[PDB]
């Protein structure tokens, strides 16, 4: 596709710019570059067509341009809600009639916010199935970087967990993370203490949350 940076970040009120690098047969030689904004889980929205044109209704905070073989989207006065993926596209004089760029994720910078952390035991319901899931929630932290590891009876766990992170929140610009520990009921029942230890910028040292299996 058309070359875009993987990611662009700035603070609210900044102006940031996303480039889109093509060739003389597309972005460089013709004035049919478009830009789309796509929020997590929604359809893209047309922000700019014909290099510089904004469809009626699109905020004048978004402007398009190009120089040589590179088009740029400039978003002025960055908002929290401006977090999204952005795609350019171009007509090409080649067999290719139309192509998209590789897309850029816009991250809004904000103050450091330590995760609030929670641990959940497997449900009584679930154990009857011969498997236990223990979940650790890291809520509303910033920056994105986190580490979470599992300790059962104090022994660091390897290879029995998966993590999922949310997209940057549109209002508070934070992230949340789940860490899920999967054990056989059998293995689960033959240990007592279950702990999630979180490491994050906004926290002096690790925060641990645990419970004891069979504790109230």
């Amino acid at each position: 596709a058309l070359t875009q940076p993987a990611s662009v970040s700035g603070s609210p009120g900044q102006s940031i710019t996303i480039s889109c690098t093509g060739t003389s047969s597309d972005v460089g030689g013709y004035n049919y570059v478009s830009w789309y904004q796509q929020h997590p889980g929604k359809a893209p929205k047309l922000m700019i067509y014909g290099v510089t044109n904004r469809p009626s209704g699109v905020s004048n905070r978004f402007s398009g341009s190009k120089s040589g073989n590179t088009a740029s989207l400039t978003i002025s006065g960055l908002q929290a809600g401006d977090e999204a993926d952005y795609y350019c596209s171009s007509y090409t004089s080649t067999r290719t009639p139309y192509v998209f760029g590789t897309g850029t994720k816009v991250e809004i910078k904000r103050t450091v916010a330590a995760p609030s952390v929670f641990i959940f035991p497997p449900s009584d319901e679930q154990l009857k199935s011969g498997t236990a899931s223990v979940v650790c929630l890291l809520n509303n932290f910033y920056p994105r970087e986190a580490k979470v590891q599992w300790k059962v009876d104090n022994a660091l766990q390897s290879g029995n967990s998966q993590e999922s992170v949310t997209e940057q929140d549109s209002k508070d610009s934070t992230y949340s993370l789940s860490s899920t520990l999967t054990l056989s009921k059998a293995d689960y029942e033959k240990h007592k203490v279950y702990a999630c230890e979180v490491t994050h910028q906004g926290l002096s040292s690790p925060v641990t949350k645990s419970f004891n299996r069979g504790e109230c």
Binding site: S34, P44, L46, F120, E125, S129, N139, S164, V165
Partner: protein, 223 residues
Amino acid sequence: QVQLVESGGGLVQPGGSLRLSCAASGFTFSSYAMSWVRQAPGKGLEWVSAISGSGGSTYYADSVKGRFTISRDNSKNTLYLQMNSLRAEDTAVYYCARDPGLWDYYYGMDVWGQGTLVTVSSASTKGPSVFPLAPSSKSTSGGTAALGCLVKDYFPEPVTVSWNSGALTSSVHTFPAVLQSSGLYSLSSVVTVPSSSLGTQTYICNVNHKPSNTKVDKKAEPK
């Protein structure tokens, strides 16, 4: 009432076939090139095919040319991606979209439908089991409590989770599904709420995995 409503997505076996539909309303469908764009899970938009307003010129991407065919109906206002010979790598959300260029093209798609998931896999539908993540006294956050539901072992995507039938939305995090080495997806949906509310408000997640006719409401509660 300007809109494009898609249908026909689903879980389809490899080498298999599928026909997608895209029903147009609120505009003169014949007057506009319409287009199919797809996005594989986590990936970018890939232009797949396009067709002239009249159908007389339909146009297609490389990666798809062999086995896909775009087509259209201006009385039924409907675009089709009869999609045949499907492979796993055509697994994506498929969108249709309008170029609003009336006498000329924008090279820009303005009106978009909502998307349809196409999953090309030889695995079969499997509904989730739903377990509470109960508010728990081993992390009692002064003023804020967390609880949730674990939605484990389903296929294909997607699953939807809401809380108290849509009443509770602020403070909800429904995490992106992750594929287990079991080949099944799993996710949790959580919510933070005042500790004080655990004694005054009941919390029930409503999970719906339409592909498997699995509907489930689970209460997430203390002790």
